[PDB]
Structure formats: structure tokens, C-alpha cells
Amino acid sequence: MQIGKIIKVSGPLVMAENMSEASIQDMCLVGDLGVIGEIIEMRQDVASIQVYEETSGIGPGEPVRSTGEALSVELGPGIISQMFDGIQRPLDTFMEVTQSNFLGRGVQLPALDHEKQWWFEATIEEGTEVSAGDIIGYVDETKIIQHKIMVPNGIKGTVQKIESGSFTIDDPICVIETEQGLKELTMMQKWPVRRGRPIKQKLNPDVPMITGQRVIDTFFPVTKGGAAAVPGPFGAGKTVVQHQIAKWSDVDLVVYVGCGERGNEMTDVVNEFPELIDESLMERTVLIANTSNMPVAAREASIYTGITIAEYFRDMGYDVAIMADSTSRWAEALREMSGRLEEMPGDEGYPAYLGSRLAEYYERSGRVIALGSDQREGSITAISAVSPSGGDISEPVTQNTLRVVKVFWGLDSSLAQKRHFPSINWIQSYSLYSTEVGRYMDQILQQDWSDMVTEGMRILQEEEQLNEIVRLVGIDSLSDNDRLTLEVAKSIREDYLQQNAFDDVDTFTSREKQFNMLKVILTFGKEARKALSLGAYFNEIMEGTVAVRERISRSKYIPEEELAKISSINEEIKETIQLIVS
Amino acid sequence: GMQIGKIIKVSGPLVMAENMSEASIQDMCLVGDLGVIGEIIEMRQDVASIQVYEETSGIGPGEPVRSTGEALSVELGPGIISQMFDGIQRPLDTFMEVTQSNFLGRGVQLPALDHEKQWWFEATIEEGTEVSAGDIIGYVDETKIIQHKIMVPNGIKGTVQKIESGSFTIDDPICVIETEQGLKELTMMQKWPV
Amino acid sequence: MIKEYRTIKEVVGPLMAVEKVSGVKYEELIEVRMQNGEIRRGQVLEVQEDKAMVQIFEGTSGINLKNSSVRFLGHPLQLGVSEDMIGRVFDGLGRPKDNGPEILPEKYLDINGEVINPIARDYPDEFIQTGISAIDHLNTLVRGQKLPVFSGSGLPHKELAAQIARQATVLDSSDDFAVVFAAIGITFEEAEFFMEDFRQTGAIDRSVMFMNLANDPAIERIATPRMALTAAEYLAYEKGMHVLVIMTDMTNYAEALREISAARREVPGRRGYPGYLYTNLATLFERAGRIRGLKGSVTQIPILTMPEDDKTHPIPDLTGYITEGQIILTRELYKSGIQPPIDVLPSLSRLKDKGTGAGKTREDHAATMNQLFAAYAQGKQAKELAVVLGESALSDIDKIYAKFAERFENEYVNQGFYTNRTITETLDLGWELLAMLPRTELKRIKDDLLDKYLP
Amino acid sequence: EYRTIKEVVGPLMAVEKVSGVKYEELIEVRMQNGEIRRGQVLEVQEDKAMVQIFEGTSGINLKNSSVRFLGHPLQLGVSEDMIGRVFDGLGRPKDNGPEILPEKYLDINGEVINPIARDYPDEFIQTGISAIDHLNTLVRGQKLPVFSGSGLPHKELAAQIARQATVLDSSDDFAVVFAAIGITFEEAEFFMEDFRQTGAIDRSVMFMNLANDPAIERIATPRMALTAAEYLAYEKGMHVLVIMTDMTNYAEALREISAARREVPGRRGYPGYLYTNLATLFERAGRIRGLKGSVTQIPILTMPEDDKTHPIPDLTGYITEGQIILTRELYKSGIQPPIDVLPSLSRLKDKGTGAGKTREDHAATMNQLFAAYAQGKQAKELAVVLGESALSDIDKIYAKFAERFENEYVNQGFYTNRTITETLDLGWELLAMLPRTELKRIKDDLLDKYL
């Protein structure tokens, strides 16, 4: 009922007097055009508002209406398979309602389709005591994802009336006897993006995600419910890494949040994903797009709407991977507002609470027991891109992220230039899940995987040690043992580490295939090592193993249907080298 | 001497007090009810900006600021030798005894030297002798090794009117001098800014 | 009626403060009437209570505050657009510069433009054959891409730019390119170079030019690329043309933003650059591409000189984080006589996959491209060692890799600015270089492909 | 119940017409819906106080909210019943067990110990890690930090030290006070499960602060934990070992509050007063003359970008008595714990070693292993630069020694508890690779006794 009056407009920052009735963090309609804003500060009756839309053409004296509610998302059927903007406005519907290929302003649009008919299957009996998280039933949203209707947080009581049928997301499908009195439920619940959805219990993520990317799964694996960062300079391949995981990982659901990035990248995903399989890929995918030239403040909104959508599906008992690409733009949006508010910056200009903001986001990710008597397990795996200026990772966003994640995939511009992809620095990168994952892999493959991987890294680390001294005098004077070492390291780098996303076969590797390739590589180093100790010469061994070493090199190209063509290289290694000694 | 003001702001190590016009720059002061150490860095009209060197936790506006009247100084006299001090000359041994505690309690103020102790002061100068800064008027055998000579402090020029050997504390008058400003009393100790 | 106020309170640098106003909007276009009748345009940066803070594009030289007035025109700065712009030369603010007639705008467009709905975009994948091997093969340009040139002062970026505009074409089509040229703070001799080449080739008669030169006011440059992109987006999506946009030099643009940023005394970022430099730049570079159902396109080739030749400098850094790759020129290659002096290793194209291959270029495009990079990166390291430690300090095969990097630079990348190679000529030459190497080295190429193409 | 909230700026709040308010005094916000949020005073002025709310500020209507000034700071209710219990950094329970019957409430800042009141560290502490026990000995009342990095296993190391820490031939048992400062749930759960799993909890008191907990709580955590330790040590007479990770997270929170008050950073973006702040914390450790018990500190910190020049490790190094350094070079070859002996140092090792405390041969072997390892690494380099052939046979041995020393001595595994005697014996075993002619830093007296 109270109407504010704009007193100041400056970029995405607007100030309105006569706001005493409103609350911090309330959404607002701003100006004559009613653009979507948020109150972030109140000094007496004056609200500082950050606008999620463009402010050109707005000025002092125009009205402000506070909606009395915090930035929320609509959660219900019709959510999967859609591209939303940062404040959850559906982009396909926007185009048709506004009749434009371009993005307009002040136009209110419901997140989901409220006219659509879904078939709701009730799976609960009348007169069951329920509370938050209990699944009263489900809608088949896609052929693969079953959308479970859960009692919203806050509601405790006894199912009075329920039945199956065709309904919109507005129709009441259940009535509950509560202490406050009868409440009716629809298939949709609203959640504030800045609150973490509650859970029964947080768990330790112990199951490794399959990315199918050899370097990640072997040396720096992420588990389901874990958090990883990919900091890298421009053009290093952060985006492509995230596309690969969206495409190939064995999560149930993928939420891809394009935060301050390229428009084309998003149109690539909507267009390419329906043509892929894992059953279409788009059918397990949600897209929030707030591109680089869309409103700055909407970058924050997008990160938050994505994780909240992810949590919603987590509660249903699903495994969810969330890609934020990139979190630097979100931080940089915070840097823009901070500067406009004339706050005292932390390092590099970012607000001092930068770290705490990041920690809130990541702490929302993870493997959990969701609320409800069922005690379902669900995971959220966070994969974040970081875009440090000049590729320098002493910067705050990378540094603060490294303190709250457990996986670091540091990309190297020097590896990208020689087209070594993914351009992960095997020396610099790490995974805290490495030890637990080794165990899980040993059990599954029924081989000593842990040991292979340790020797792999041990060799890579020796290569590094050597190359330091080498780049100033080496090679000519190197011992045969060490010459061999450089060759095994070279085989790892080229034959195993290097993998091209765009090759039909090399785009994905199964564990059965990864294990076989690495065995073949280490078997070479082992058998060659034993030959040197019997009196053979490096040069003898290399000249005598040209054909077999070509096979090892091309095993990345062997089809999954033909793994014997790889594991059979192991016999050829042993025979060939056994022969050379005599 | 001691000057009392009132705290108007507390912000971490920074305290601001008003009604400090009798205070000067670089003066040491005791901050708050508690009395933790501070130094006056700035002065605006009657408002002093004070750097506080101990925890200001639990200090608020309305509480006093007591000004020492001077900048950091040392007490110089019999009782100095063989003592262990901290950087602002807080006597560690005396802390233990008076305090009966193992801590350098904050807000606890103790003179660097024993002002209660008896010293035999052997006068070696004669009445009617003209004197200026540095002249030895007597000595005290302070330790088993060192003889503590009692010098006319800087800023004093005159003639010795009365002086006697005997047992005094470092606060007792031990000599009378005829300055240009009439008669002045000397004791066995002098203060100097560090 | 327009709003005019005679209450200028403050004239400090490029900034003016007007007080006792009402009805003023953020971004509103303004005209200052000086005491002598001279008119200077501007833009509202900030509006609060009864005050507005405006930036004057034409500078504030010679103003008497008391006797000048400000008009607030009731709208943002716009370009009066017309297909009749084609063939005309304009200044940095879109006003005719060439003594020609008109124009009667078909309409006015706000120069900020609007963001293309990502659902509404077509993904760009039509290969443009520039005729330059170092681009078409290794850093492929596609219609609708933003592909900048990173350069340095004293380097021939303008020679390269002209070559590309001159030879660029899609295959299996007779489409041509309309060119929008935006000069931003560049010299007469540089601007006259493009002019001379556009006249020579006749491309002048399908070009629109927005010219801000080194003698024009600096603040005007903040407006200039936006005029040019408004013209280009209009030509493409409203008049259905394929548009090539060349803007140079973007470093001058960012210098202007800093000037205003500094004058406003905003919180500075790195080096005094504003916190919104990334965002500001993206509002230019993301105005490129293609839209579903509309036959035109906007392909952007921005040019910048990297200060101190330092690619980590905020201008190239952020620019690189926005655009779809970059073509880098290096002083080393230039002095060695390589033309164009493109350093392929740090150069990139992000849109090369879907635009090349069978049915677009040839089925061996990507394999050879990857292979060449591998051999070049390694060969280049080997060549440099040999310069330091002597050829004798090199292995038998690294000696070969080094000779490869010489042939690659001297023959392949160095073609000259008047040489137009078909992709087929380029791919074939690539093989001739790769044949220098033993079959075992060529790990990046599958056996199927080697059998077929390798001599 | 002042109904006078003038401003909300982010999580900061301006409260007007208040009197008698102190710096760092706790507050309560009663919102218009009745919700209660707690806060602390960050700045106080004649007419106003600046407060920070812990739960943040969203949804508060200024004119309809009220603030109450509690009249006190953060205080810890000490009791001997906290042993075997888990708290958050504010000292509220997180273990779902019975409530704490407090003997009293204490301020958490503590006090500076009069130097002439301190006692010299006398006792050896058996961490069970050879790399520490032998070459960088930890002594009761020392402040010996661990300098680590992101992705480095200080988690495991901290847990191990906490399981294995013991004094020898004392039947007296170590109380272990463990503080986690701004660490992830996953890290905090690992520590809690480890303590429960091995029964280490029965000796321990845990203060568990998480990364999404407020910055103010995060700054409180170490002080809560040290107050508890000083209570157990100097009131209960216990011998206390205090383990705190990650100290870099604490400095991070200090910055956050520092900016809130618009204070310009000192070196490298950190408050001028960081040294006073860190010193104040770390010096709350040691022995006091005439008092039975002691506090021993092991603060753990990550050095950003592996930079020992960084203000945190650099300023910490001046305050503490040595440092144990983990390196990724070692970690990537699988050395567990990846401790680099060469840059590591204990400043008080001598006071804890030799006849009567460990064994007579301790110091001499430490000095020898230290040199032989240095020589071994040099020999390794020589191998690369001049080649196999230029190596003396005596040189090849040093090479093999440095290899075995990393692989067998330093690499004991995160679950292997070595007695001092096993460590000493293994060293000798390793030294035995060399000729007697080479062991120049050991008296022949000892060569003949131990081989």
C-alpha cells in the first residue's frame, strides 16, 4: 500500500524515499516501468535498491512498490528442460509473449507454465501423518525424471484428502489437517534463493563421479556431493570441461548456470543437448542463463536460483551436478555494487565478505539425508569455473574458493597453447577425494588402481624434477634410468593425459578403458626398467619398441567394444622386450 | 600532571576522547575505567585521537581518559640496577609481589622503582658550591659493584644551600638549590623522556 | 517542448553538474548551449533529487557556467538509421563528415541496443575463408563470430584487418560483406589507410564509417563503437545484410572509460580502470552473431594494441575473456619478416569445431590443425635451444622439429598481405609440412586419415 | 529494548540513542515477526553503536524492530565436564548430549604472562611421527606450528598428532583441546569421526567452527578454545595440547571486520594489528612457575600460493618456536606425511632430548641424518647434471640414502605410531648405509654402541 519515491538513480543502484514499510531483501517494482529490484540497504526511510534490469530512462520522482517478498523461485513440474534467466524468467516464453528476439524490461513473467496439465499420481493414503519432505505423490515430468511432490517445509499434519488426476500447478491436490487449521497443497512450492533448503543430515561424499575425462577420473576425481574448482585464464578450457561433465557424468540431473558469460555458449547447449543421449540429454538438464551483457546484479541471482533448484531436486533423492560458469562474474558483480555503494574493499577491490559469500554457496552443496520419514539420500556436486585476471591465482576469488572446495583443476595457458587438453596442471592440481576414490576403484576394478595412480603421479613429479635441471644442460648427459623415466612421463602426458573433447571416440573414456590404457603405459615402464637392469640399453629398447609404442599411443582411439585390442598390448610389450635382451 | 577526559568513540584500537585540551601530542594516557595504555596521536580542538595498545574490548563512551602529563619516560634513580623491566619500564619483579599474580594485569599501574626504600646518600659536595647539570652532589652504593652518582638534573643551575648525608628514599628532598626561580628541592631521582 | 535549465553548478574536467532540475533520467542525452551559441552533446551519468551529473563528449573547453544552459532532450543518445548510410562517412557521434546530403532516418535507435535473447540466437558455424592459412586452418573464423586482433604499436594490424575485409567470403555462395568501420582515437594516417583501401577495392560503396580520430574529443569515443554497432545490428537484423564490423583501436575506448571513471572519482579497480570494465566491454562484443529466422549476421573484428605488449594488462585480459578467441601479432615474428606476423600458439578460435570438417572445409581440417600445433610448439622450443646451445645440443628428431618450425613460419604463416589461399591450398600445404616428420610422430592423426592424405 | 534502528547496511546495523554500550558487547535483535538474532558491537560512539548480526539481516523491518544490549561480551562457561564433548566456536554444544553445568563464565581474551613467571619447557612429547619427534622435537609448553597448503594433508596430520600425542613414563594424560576455524563440514566431520572412532574424544574438547558460520564466531573460536585450555591447564592442573586449523581462515575473518570499520590494511591486505592479534593468541601457551599444568600449541595454517613470505606464515614464524613445513613436492611422490625436514625447525628441541628424556643418541643422529640427507639431495642433482659416471661410490650411497630417507623414514603413513625408540633405531639403520668414515658428527663413543 506504501509507494516509494525514487530520489537517486545511478546505474543499477536506485534509492527511494518513503520505504519505511518494507524490509531488507524485499523485491521491488521500480519506476514507471516497474523493473525488478531488491532492497539491500535501508537508512531511515530510504531504500538502496539493486536493479535486476536496465535503468536507462529512469529518474527521481517515479514510484516504487515493494512486493513484500524475497527473491524466490517457483519449484514444480515444468521446470526441467527449460532455459531461465537469472531471476527465473523462462526465455522461450519471454520471446513469444514480448514478440521479440531481444530482451525487454519491466515485464512480469511466471517461472513455470501455470496452465499446463500434468498427471499427478498420489502414492500416499488418507490419514497419514506427514511433515516436510514427505512425498505425497509424483508427476512424470520426463521419461527419465520422476517429479516427486513433497510436503513443503513448515507444514506438519494429517493427509485428509488426496487422489490422482489431471491438474495444473495451481489446483489443490491434497488437503492436510494441521494444528493451525486445514491447509491445501498444490504441486508447486516457493523457496527463497538465499536460504539453504533444510536437510536432516549432511554426509561424506564417498562415491566418485564419472566424468569420462581421463585426467580427472584418475588423478583428480570428484565424488558425488563434492565441490571442485576450475580456475584458469581465458581460452584454457574451463567452459569445455564443464560441458563434458554436463554431457557424460552419471548424475541424475544437471543444472547449468551460465553466469556472466557468452550468449552463444548457452545457445550451443539448448540446441546440441536435445540431440544427445544418456533418452535425450536435455531431459535431465536445467539452464539458467545470465550472459555477460545482461544486467550485472542478475549474476548473483542466477547462482542462487540454480543451487536452490538443485537443492529442490536433491530433496527428491536425486544426484545433481551444478555447474557455475563462471563464479568470477558473480564476485565481479559484487565488486561493482560494493564500489557503487562506496564500501571499503577487501583485496583487489572485492568486498571483504567475499570469502563468506563463497563459503555459503559451497556449503550448500554436498551429499545428504533429505527431510522426511523415507530418509532419502541425495547429492549436489558443485563444479565451478574461476576466471582470475591474467591467470594469476593469488587473486581473492581463487584463493577463497580453494579454501572451501576439495578439488582444484588448475588450467595452464602454456598447456593450452601446445593444445594439450584438458589443460590441467598435473603438478599443481589436487583432489582431496583421491585416497577414498582409489579404494573405491580398487574394489570395483579388482586391481591395484591406487598404486598405479601413485606411480603415475610419482613419475610425473620426477619428470618435473628432471626438466628443471634438464632445461639448462640435460639430455646429453642423462642416465638411462632417467631417460626411461622421461619416456614414461611422456607416454602418460601424450597417451593418457591428452584427450580431445571433439573427437567422436576420445570424448569419453570408461573406467574399464582408462584402467587398460594406464596399465599398458606402466607395463612399458616396468618391463623396460627390468631390461635396463639386465644390461640392455635405452637406445636398444626404444629402437626395438617402435611398433608397440605406436599401439600404446593410439589406444585412446580404440572403441569401447574392443578393449581386448588394448589389454593385448601387455603381452606384446613383454615378448618384444624379453626378445631384445637376447 | 594528570588530566582527565571523556571517551566519545571506541573503534578497535582507536579511541577518541573530548575535553583533552590540557593534554599534548605524544602523551601517554590510561584509557577507560580499566586504564589500558594509549598514546595521543592527534588533537582536534579538544578532541584527541588515541591509539590503544591493549585490548579495548569492553570499553565504551562516557568513560575517562587519564593523561599522564608527559610522553613515555623512565624513572632514573637508586633501585634501577639489577631490575628487570618491560619496554615501558614496568617492573616485572614488583608486578609479582604487589600483584600476587602471574600476569601483567591490564590497567595495573606500578612505579618503575621502589619509592618506599631507604638509601644511604653520601653527600660529597659542599654548601655554597655553584652547580649545573651533570655535577655530582653525592653518591649511593647501590649494589655490590656499582656506585650510583646523584647528578644535578638537566634544567637546574644554582648554588647548593643545604645538603646532608643520611638515609633517604628516592622521593625525599636531599639537597636545596638557589636557582633563578628561587629555591628548588632535589631528590635522588630524575625523569627523562625515552 | 524540450527541458532547458540555466543552472550549471560545476564544470570539472569532462563533468558538468546541473542543479534545480526535474524530469531528468539516467542516460538521457543532453546538449549544452554555450554562451557563444556553440552546442555540445552529453549524457546523464547520475541523477539525484534536483541534480544531474553529465559527461560532455565534446569537452568543456571555454564554457562560462553562468551564461551557458543545458537541454535535456527526453531520450537516450540514438542513431538516426537508414539504408542510405551505406557509402557514407560519419564522425564519432554519427553526424555526416563527407559533405554529402541527408539523411532522413527511417528510425532512431538507442545506441546501447538490447541483449539478444539466447533462445533467439542461431549458433554461428558458416566458415569464412579469409585466405590466410594461420586463420582459416588453425584459428578459424565463422560468420557471426567476434574475433579480435591483439597487436602492439608499430605492428601491422591494419594491414591484416584490410586483408581480411578484402578477401573474406563464405564458400558455395556469392554473399558479400557490408563493412561497418569504427575509428576510435586513431591517427589520420591510420584512418586514411583503411579509407584508401576501401576506395581501391570498391568496398567503400558498401561501407558505413564512424570516425573518431586522435584530434577528436576523447570522451566522444565512449559513444563511437556503440554508434557503429547500432548501425551494424540495424543493417543485419533489420535490413538483412551480412555485416563485418572492424573497430580500432579498442585500447583508446577503455582509456576514455578510465578518464570518466577517474573524473567521477569512482572506486578504481586495477590500474585505475573501473570495476565495470569487463561489463562495459561485453555490452559491445556480445553484439555480434546471428538470430534464428533472420538472414543477416554481424561479424566483429575488434582491434586493440596491448599496452607494453603485455597480454595480462586489463584491456587484453578482459577483452580475451569476452570474445571468441583472438589473433595475436608479435614483434618477434614481424622483425623476422613473417606476414602476417600471427603467433599461432597464443591465438585462438572458440568456434572452429562446428565450422570445419566434412561438408564445410575438408575431413582432415581438425586433425592436421591439431597436429601442426603440436609440431610447432615443440619445434619452436627446439629451434630456440639450438640458437643458444648450438645445433649439436639438439636430438636427431628435434633437429627435424626445428627445421619444421622454420618452414612453418617462413612458408605457411608467412604468405604476404596480398595472398588469398583457398582452404584446399591451405590444407594441402599443411600436409607438405607434416610430411617432413616421421609417421610415428603424428599421434594426433588417426591411421585412417594418414593412409589417405600423407605423401 | 531500544526501538531505535536507524540504518541497516548489509549485515551492519546502526542503533541510535543508546548509552552505556561497550565495544564487543553482545546484542539481541527482536524483529517485527518476533524472530531473535544475536549480534556484536563493532563500533560505539557517543550517540550510536555499530553492530553486526550473526544470522545476517534479511527480512528485518527497521522501524518495527528492537535491540537489546545484553551487558556483556562473549564468555565461556568453563567446567571439567566439557572433556569428551563437542562444541561450536561459541561454545554451545553440537553433540546432542546433556547441558553444561558451568562452574563460572570467563572472558576469552586471557592475560599476558609476566615473563619472570614462565617456566622453561622440560618435557618431551611423543607425537609418534619420526620427522617431528627426532628432527623437530616438540616439547611441553612449546608453540610449534604446521605450515601447509591447499590440497595438502594437514587434516590427516592434525588427526594423527591428536591420536598419538603422549608424554613418556608419565601416567599423566594429555587433554587435547581441538579448534576448527572456518573449515568445511566434510573436514569437520572427519575430525569428529576420527575422535569418536579412536576414543580420542575421551581426552578431548572440540570447538568446531564451520566456513558458513559468521565471521565473528570464527574470530571467537580460537579464543574460546584457549580459554578452555588455560582453565584445564592452570585450574585443573592438566597438561593440554591445543590444535587449531586453519589459522588462515581466522585472518580472513579479521579482514572482514576490519573493513566493516573502514580501516586501511597494513602489509598485503591485512590489518596493521595482525601481529598483536596473532601474538596474543599464540603466547597463551607454556609452563608457569609454581603451577602443575601446561598448554602446548600446534597451530595449523595454509600458506596461500605456497608463499612462506606471506604475512600469515611470516608473522606466525616470528611468534612461534619453529615450524613444521609440508610440501607438495613431497606429497606428489606419495610421502606421508609430506614433511620437509630441511626448512622445518623446532627452536626448543634440545630441552626435550637426550639421556633421561629420549635416549643419549638423539641429537647426534638428528644432526647426522640432517646432513646426510642434504648431501644425498646434492648427490642426486650431480647425477642429473654430470651423469651416472661422475658419481663417487660414496656419492651413490648418499643418493640411495636420501631416497630411503624420504621413502622409509619420513614416509611412515598417517596411521603409524612410532615410539621414539623405533624412530631412533630406524635412523641408525638408515645411517648404517654409510661408512663409519662418513658419520663425522657422531662421537665414536656412540658409533660403537649403535652401529
Ligand SMILES: Nc1ncnc2c1ncn2[C@@H]1O[C@H](COP(=O)(O)OP(=O)(O)NP(=O)(O)O)[C@@H](O)[C@H]1O
Ligand atoms: N578438452 C578440450 N578438447 C578440445 N578442445 C578444447 C578443450 N578445451 C579447450 N579446447 C579449445 O579451447 C577453446 C577454449 O575453451 P573454453 O572452455 O571456451 O576456454 P575458457 O577457459 O572457458 N575461456 P573463458 O570462458 O574466456 O574463461 C575451445 O573452443 C576449444 O577450441
Ligand SMILES: [Mg+2]
Ligand atoms: Mg568459458
